[PDB]
């Protein structure tokens, strides 16, 4: 039922739908080199994507149901200038009728307007005053459904967030043009990233929404914290979802030492704007290829884990012959790893997005178990354990300008 479906192909954005919308791209639109479907719009007049729909499919009805889906990534709002500044990002208003998506500090907004200037708005609000956010500077799946007899609904990552009655709106006559552009944003530093914009000529149901989410999410490729492809040879700060206010540290190099979780994390703060845990804390992990893998970490890939201590790499490993169910993990000199267990199988696991698991194996093909932690009196030591289902879920956090913390 897709009447517009925008994808990157052959050095261009095209409509895959049978309606072949014309797409005009301004000279200040940018693409991620790792994934050209990830479009970046910045706060300049020529950072524009203009989609011209065929007359045939322009929305002009009291009764026709319709839906939109897209993924968005919204950098953290840093300053008072971002408060109280609703800005359009996707505009389909003509002569004060149609629809639009807009943003504000902590908000995604859907606006419907009929030809008598009755309006209805549905809103997703997310806080920047949280230790760890599912939303800030992370890919979010947005779905908005419109049943002209009942309600407008906004879904985030397949979950219903807000719904409002719209049966009081009359004829909505939207534009033949969809303008992707930051419109009315007073912060010249603002940008968004967007991908997989779709229009549908029905009210999508919860099952169709979940299937779209799961499909476009692509559980075959692991994700970093921000929702980008997880990569080999890229340093990552580590987050244990069960103990999110702790960071990984090393208690000495070698088999007689251990890795462990230490807390609390620091805070990054601008009064009244954000108050978050520091993400750039603790010993970084680097994922190493075990094989003929390409640059992206895929579900069930076999890897080594390198740990960075004072700008030197060591190997995550254990002696699985150590008595006990929990096998305490150490940072080994790479030349000394010998016969220690070190091969890891990376697994995707997609509530909170971007969860990864790591399954340790010995050199004889035996599972030692998922990597998590175990409390030994006051110290949360990293372990591999067949006991693993809480404490064995991890996120990998690279430095990102959309998060803005100091290195």
Author numbering: 876 to 1165, 1168 to 1227, 1230 to 1267, 1277 to 1295
Quote the original article.
Botulinum neurotoxins (BoNT) are a group of clostridial toxins that cause the potentially fatal neuroparalytic disease botulism. BoNTs are composed of three domains—a cell-binding domain, a translocation domain, and a catalytic domain. For BoNT/A, the HC/A binds to both a ganglioside (e.g., GD1a) and synaptic vesicle protein 2 (SV2C) at the nerve terminals of the neuromuscular junction.
This loop (which is conserved across all BoNT/A subtypes) precedes the ganglioside binding site (GBS) and appears to be disordered for other HC/A subtypes. In both the HC/A2 and HC/A2:GD1a structures, clear electron density was observed between Lys 1236 and Cys 1280 indicating the presence of an unusual covalent bridge between the two residues. Further, a recent report based on a systematic study on the presence of Lys-Cys bridges in protein structures revealed that oxygen is the most likely bridging atom; therefore, we modelled this atom in the final deposited coordinates.
